[PDB]
Amino acid sequence: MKSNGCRYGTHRVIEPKGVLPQPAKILNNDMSEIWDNEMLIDVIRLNIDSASFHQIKNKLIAQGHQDLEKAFAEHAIELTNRTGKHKNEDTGSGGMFIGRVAAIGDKFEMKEEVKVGDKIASLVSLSLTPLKINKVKKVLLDKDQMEIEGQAILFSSGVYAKLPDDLDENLALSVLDVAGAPAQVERLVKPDDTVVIIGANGKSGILCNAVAKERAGICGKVIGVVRNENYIPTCKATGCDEVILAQATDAITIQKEVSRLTNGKMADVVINVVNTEDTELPSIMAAKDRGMVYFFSMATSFTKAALGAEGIGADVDMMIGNGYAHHHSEIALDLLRRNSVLMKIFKERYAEHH
Amino acid sequence: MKSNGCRYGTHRVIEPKGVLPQPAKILNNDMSEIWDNEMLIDVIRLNIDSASFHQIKNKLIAQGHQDLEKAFAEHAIELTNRTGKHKNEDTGSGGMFIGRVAAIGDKFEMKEEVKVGDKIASLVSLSLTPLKINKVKKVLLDKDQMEIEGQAILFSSGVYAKLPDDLDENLALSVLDVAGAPAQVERLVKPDDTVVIIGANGKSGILCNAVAKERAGICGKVIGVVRNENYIPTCKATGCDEVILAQATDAITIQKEVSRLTNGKMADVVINVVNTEDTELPSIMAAKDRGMVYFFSMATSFTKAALGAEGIGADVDMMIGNGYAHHHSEIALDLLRRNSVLMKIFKERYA
Ligand SMILES: NC(=O)c1ccc[n+]([C@@H]2O[C@H](COP(=O)([O-])OP(=O)(O)OC[C@H]3O[C@@H](n4cnc5c(N)ncnc54)[C@H](OP(=O)(O)O)[C@@H]3O)[C@@H](O)[C@H]2O)c1
Ligand SMILES: NC(=O)c1ccc[n+]([C@@H]2O[C@H](COP(=O)([O-])OP(=O)(O)OC[C@H]3O[C@@H](n4cnc5c(N)ncnc54)[C@H](OP(=O)(O)O)[C@@H]3O)[C@@H](O)[C@H]2O)c1
Ligand SMILES: [Cl-]
Ligand SMILES: [Cl-]
Numbered sequence: 001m002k003s004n005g006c007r008y009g010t011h012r013v014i015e016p017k018g019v020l021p022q023p024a025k026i027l028n029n030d031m032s033e034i035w036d037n038e039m040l041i042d043v044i045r046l047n048i049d050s051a052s053f054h055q056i057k058n059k060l061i062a063q064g065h066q067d068l069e070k071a072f073a074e075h076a077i078e079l080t081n082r083t084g085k086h087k088n089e090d091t092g093s094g095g096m097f098i099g100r101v102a103a104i105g106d107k108f109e110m111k112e113e114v115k116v117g118d119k120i121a122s123l124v125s126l127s128l129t130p131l132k133i134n135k136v137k138k139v140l141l142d143k144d145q146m147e148i149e150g151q152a153i154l155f156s157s158g159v160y161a162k163l164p165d166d167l168d169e170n171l172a173l174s175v176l177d178v179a180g181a182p183a184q185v186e187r188l189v190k191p192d193d194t195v196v197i198i199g200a201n202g203k204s205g206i207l208c209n210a211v212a213k214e215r216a217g218i219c220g221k222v223i224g225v226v227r228n229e230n231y232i233p234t235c236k237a238t239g240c241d242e243v244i245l246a247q248a249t250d251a252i253t254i255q256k257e258v259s260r261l262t263n264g265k266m267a268d269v270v271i272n273v274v275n276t277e278d279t280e281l282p283s284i285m286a287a288k289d290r291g292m293v294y295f296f297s298m299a300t301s302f303t304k305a306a307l308g309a310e311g312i313g314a315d316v317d318m319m320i321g322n323g324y325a326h327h328h329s330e331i332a333l334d335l336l337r338r339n340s341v342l343m344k345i346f347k348e349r350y351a352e353h354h
Numbered sequence: 355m356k357s358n359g360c361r362y363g364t365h366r367v368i369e370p371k372g373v374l375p376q377p378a379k380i381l382n383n384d385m386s387e388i389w390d391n392e393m394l395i396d397v398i399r400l401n402i403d404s405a406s407f408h409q410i411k412n413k414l415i416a417q418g419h420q421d422l423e424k425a426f427a428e429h430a431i432e433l434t435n436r437t438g439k440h441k442n443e444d445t446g447s448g449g450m451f452i453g454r455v456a457a458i459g460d461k462f463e464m465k466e467e468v469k470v471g472d473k474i475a476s477l478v479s480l481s482l483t484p485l486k487i488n489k490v491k492k493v494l495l496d497k498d499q500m501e502i503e504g505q506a507i508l509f510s511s512g513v514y515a516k517l518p519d520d521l522d523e524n525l526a527l528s529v530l531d532v533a534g535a536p537a538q539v540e541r542l543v544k545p546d547d548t549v550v551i552i553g554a555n556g557k558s559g560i561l562c563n564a565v566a567k568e569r570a571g572i573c574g575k576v577i578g579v580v581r582n583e584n585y586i587p588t589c590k591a592t593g594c595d596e597v598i599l600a601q602a603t604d605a606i607t608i609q610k611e612v613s614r615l616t617n618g619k620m621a622d623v624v625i626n627v628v629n630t631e632d633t634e635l636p637s638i639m640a641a642k643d644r645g646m647v648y649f650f651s652m653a654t655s656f657t658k659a660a661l662g663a664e665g666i667g668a669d670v671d672m673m674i675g676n677g678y679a680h681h682h683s684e685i686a687l688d689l690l691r692r693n694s695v696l697m698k699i700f701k702e703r704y705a
Contacts, residue, residue, distance in 0.1 A: 008639075008666055010606060020605055020635065022665050111667075124665050129582060157666040180664075252364060268486050271692045281374070285362070295656070295674070302656045302674060304650070311376055312511040313360055313465070318674035320649070320656055323664045 005035030005310040007109060009155035012130050014084065021155070022128035027084030030182075031151040036107040041120065043099040044133070046076075046086065046146045047173075052093035053144035059090075073136035076146060087127040094127030095144075097152055097241050098163070109156035112330065119296040121176055122152070123159040123329065159331035172194045172333070174350035178204040179332035180323035181273060181296055182211045186331065188269050188292055189215035196258055196267040196286045197240070198248050199274035200224025201231035203350070204296060206238040207332060208271050213239030223261055225254060237341050248274045251282040258286045272297055272321075281308035287316045296321035359389025361463060363509040366484050368438070375509070376482035383484040383507075390461040391510040394476065395448040397485070400430075400500045401527075402439065406447035407498040415442075427490035430500060434487045436586060441481035448481030449498075452505055452517070453658030463510035466684065475530060476506070477513040477678070515683035526687075526703035532558035533686035534677035535627060535650050536565045540685065542623050542646055543569035550612055550621040550640045551594070552602050554578025555585035555630035557704065558650060561686060562625050564693050567593035577615055591695050603627045605636040612640045626651055626675075634659040641670045650675030675699040 005011050008020060012035075015026040034040050048056075056075055057068065065071035080086050087094055101118045104110075112317065114120060130153040136149040154160055161176050164171060181204035189195055195212040199205045205224070213222045224240035226232070227247050235243045244257040258266055266288035272279060273296045280300060283293050293316050295305065305318050325331075336343045347354070359365050362374055366389075369380035387527050402410075410429055411422060419425035434440050455472045456466075458563075468474060476483065484507040492501040508514055515530050518524060535558035543549055549566040553559045555578070556609055567576045578594035580586070581601050589597045596615050600607040612620055620642035626633055632651045638659070641647050647670050649659065659672050692699045 008606075008609075017608060018604075022635075022662075124667070125661070126373060128665050141491060157668075159664070159667045201375075250372075252362075252372060255362075260563050298657055298660065300656045302654045303652055306652065306677055307479075310513070311482055312374075313478070313513045313617045313678055314511075315676070315678060315680050320672035322670065322672060323660060323670075324667055326669050332390060339445045 001105060002033055002035040002066070005037040005105070005107070005156070007037060007156035009128065009157065011035055012084070012153065013161070014078050018242055020128070021130070024121070025083065028129045029080065029084035029132045031132050031153070033293065034103060034105055034153065036105040037109060037156040038105050039101065039108050040103040041097065041099040041122075041152045042102045042156065043097045043148060043150045043152050045098045046095060046126070046148055047097070048086070048095040048126070048144045048146065050144045050157055051296070052088035052091050052095065055088060057141065059079070059279040067137040067298040069140060072139045072141070073146070076136060077133050080131050085126060085131050086131055092127060094125035094129070096122045096124070096126060097129070097131075099152065102151065111159065112162055113169035114160070114162050114247050119158045119163045121163055121173060122154065123161055123176060123324070129153065159165060159324055165229070166335060168347065168353050168354035171350050172349055174203065174346065175336060177331050179328040180321070180325055182207040182335055183325040183328035183331045184294060184321065185211045185271060186215060186293060191215070191217045192220050192266065193268040194223065194262055194265065195271065196223045196225060196271045198225045198270065198272045198279060198283055198286070200235045200240060200243070201226050201228070202273055204273040205341060206234065206345060207335060209235060209239035210342055211335060212269070212271070213241070215274065221262065223258060234345065238345065246274060248279040248282060254282045255285040267291055270294065272300070275299055277301065278304065280305040282312050284309050284316055284318070287314070289315060289318050293318045295319065355459065356387060359391045359459070360620055361391055361510040363482065363511065365389060366438070366507070374482070375484075376479065379437065379511065381484045383434065383438035383486045385486050385505040385507070388457060388459055388507065390459045391463060392459045393455065393462050393506060393508040394457040395451065395453040395476075396456045397450045397451045397502055397504045397506050397507045400449060400480070400502055401451065401498065401628075402440065402449040402480070402498045403442070404498045406442040406445055406449065409442060409445055411495070413559045422495060423493040423508040426493045427500070430490060431487050433603040434485050439480060439483055439485050446481060448479035450476045450480060450481070451483070451485075453506065456505060465513065466516055466681075468514075468516055469572065472518045473519070474514045475517055475527060476508065477479075477515055477530060477683070483507065504603055508635075509599045513678055518687065522701070524705035525700055528557065529686050529690060529700065530683055532561065534562040535681055536689055537679040537682035537685045538648065538676060539625055540564045540569060542648060543574070544573050544622070545569070545571045547622040548575040548577065548619065549623045550577045550579060551625045551627065551639055552579045552608075552633060552640070553626065554594055554597070555580045555582070556627055556629070560588065560696060560699060561689060562627055563593035564689060564696055565587060566625070567595070575616070577621070578613060587701065588701040592699065602630055602633040602636060605639050608636045610641040621645055624648065628656070629653055631655065632658065635662040636670050638663050638670055638672070639666070640669070643669060643671050647672045648675055649673065650677070
């Protein structure tokens with residue numbers, strides 16, 4: 001056991017010196033000894049970022065490989081052996097892993113309480129994760145997955161979650177993927193608030209509907225925005241009092257309908273969980289004066305949000321949605337255990353085994 | 355005077371119907387009658403977005419013009435007459451205007467109090483502003499400016515500022531340019547807070563230093579981050595208690611130095627006012643747990659900030675720096691009037 005490990009993991013950065021593990025080019029993936037504030041994982045499965053997986057697959061096709069599973073497996077071993085991690089060298093994307101705890105340093109900053117042998121999922125990207133792949137058992141070309149024998153390091157600053165014994169693994173992973181959204185909504189929504197959820201039928205959207213309605217309470221108002229009439233029942237069953245039919249890019253219709261439904265008062269909190277571009281101004285205009293607009297979509301443009309609010313004189317607070325929050329996995333999993341409607345929808349949509 | 359004008363201005367959108375004035379292709383710039391919630395301006399000068407001005411200049415050269423001032427003037431007349439606004443048709447960029455209030459609709463949402471004749475600057479883009487150019491008097495090729503006779507519409511949702519007749523106009527416009535930064539900093543900093551200002555020697559930075567120190571007070575702590583030791587006296591004179599020398603992209607140095615100056619407690623509030631990319635993670639790591647990180651720079655990447663905080667388990671709030679806030683002009687100008695050190699620096703730097 002090595003001493004004086006950096007919680008941010010800089011002790012494993014080989015190239016270039018003086019940067020963090022994520023932007024680094026080469027990490028130390030020597031698993032024979034760990035630092036005192038690290039956690040070592042026996043990796044079972046690698047869930048590669050879909051864009052990275054597709055980009056690597058197509059690069060290999062273009063180079064002329066016929067056996068794609070074998071070419072991909074060999075690509076992953078070469079990449080991880082040389083750079084210490086599975087960070088896509090063209091996109092910068094990573095992924096996450098599933099495995100069982102192998103060793104815990106005595107100064108590891110424990111978050112969720114876990115012990116050797118526990119089954120866990122990482123909630124930080126493979127783009128900063130020291131990873132040693134000893135064997136690729138299977139490349140699942142259609143699932144962006146590799147079943148492997150290997151090991152990974154979590155730094156004390158990293159994030160992980162114990163996978164619950166009583167839940168379908170893919171169901172649990174689906175909640176963990178978006179756990180930050182309901183966690184943040186719980187912090188934002190006051191009793192009696194009006195809340196507008198843009199993209200309310202989505203995976204994070206239906207979780208946001210439910211905690212928004214729990215937090216806003218009996219005299220609050222939760223308004224979902226969807227573009228498909230097919231989604232109205234689900235939005236209402238998961239917490240929406242009202243549903244607006246609009247493209248999330250249609251600022252005028254959303255403003256008009258939110259105004260109708262609130263008698264001009266508009267929303268205290270706007271939660272944006274769409275996966276498309278140019279929805280910043282429609283979200284801003286749904287808010288009341290000094291309201292809160294929480295942008296979760298990775299499609300959000302900083303400049304479009306900033307210039308959007310300036311051009312129409314909207315004095316609103318606009319937050320970059322932080323996917324991490326203390327206890328967010330436990331909070332999101334507890335939401336599904338309290339709400340049988342959500343649990344049934346999540347199992348139907350995202351459970352592997354039915 | 356027509357009634358039931360939309361505060362967002364959709365009643366002047368001709369093409370395509372169903373979008374807002376800024377994304378619209380064609381606006382109605384008929385100034386003979388205004389709507390009840392509009393304000394009509396006699397425009398003196400058009401400050402064209404510099405990139406837009408340069409793109410139009412070069413387009414005209416390539417078409418074969420030679421007398422650029424005259425071709426540019428004719429370009430602006432054709433563009434505004436046809437589309438109703440000076441929105442650059444290739445880039446989408448606009449600009450702002452300076453003018454005198456001509457008429458005030460009876461239902462205009464008054465922000466700062468102005469009456470007919472007041473000298474004002476628009477603080478919203480020419481790309482959403484109905485604009486009629488009756489004459490171009492002078493095209494200033496080195497200044498991205500046109501002196502004109504014409505009129506413009508401010509919607510009730512628009513933003514403007516009265517230009518005080520007692521201050522140099524370039525100085526006033528420079529303050530208006532960054533007024534949202536001190537205004538927003540005033541709301542975030544509590545007494546006894548530790549505040550880190552990244553880019554503390556810049557135009558917005560020195561205003562943020564001063565506001566951070568008055569709000570954090572005698573037992574608060576204001577830390578500037580700059581990369582030049584020559585900037586230290588200015589940072590301290592405008593409010594910093596301590597100054598860190600680091601590149602704003604150097605997350606490890608900034609984290610270590612903020613930790614040193616705060617005994618590991620880190621910053622309650624981080625203000626990022628640099629004009630450089632890849633400073634998100636350094637800003638996040640300067641904050642304490644559940645601290646507030648305010649990104650003012652237009653170089654801020656949404657995904658870099660979100661994924662940055664996620665990867666190191668930083669439960670911090672990250673705010674998109676708005677740039678507009680109620681009364682921001684008045685608040686920033688009052689800061690200069692109350693703080694002789696800032697006024698003197700702003701005078702020397704920004705004419
Ligand atoms: N940082 C984090 O950890 C974090 C946390 C939560 C969310 N997020 C982000 O939030 C976004 C949503 O993620 P998710 O997993 O919830 O995705 P999802 O399940 O695909 O949900 C997206 C929803 O938005 C709707 N939508 C997209 N574009 C639309 C438009 N133009 N008009 C109307 N509706 C539209 C979709 O419905 P249609 O069927 O109509 O397309 C869908 O219901 C992603 O960008 C994700 O990265 C990130
Ligand atoms: N409209 C809005 O929403 C709004 C409002 C307020 C601020 N802002 C934004 O804030 C940014 C700054 O505005 P400004 O007018 O204050 O600009 P400015 O006067 O040029 O200030 C930028 C400051 O940052 C420093 N800096 C830049 N890169 C650095 C690096 N890598 N390391 C250390 N220091 C660095 C510069 O110092 P050096 O001399 O060392 O380069 C300079 O002092 C702009 O992007 C602006 O758009 C926008
Ligand atoms: Cl006219
Ligand atoms: Cl962005």
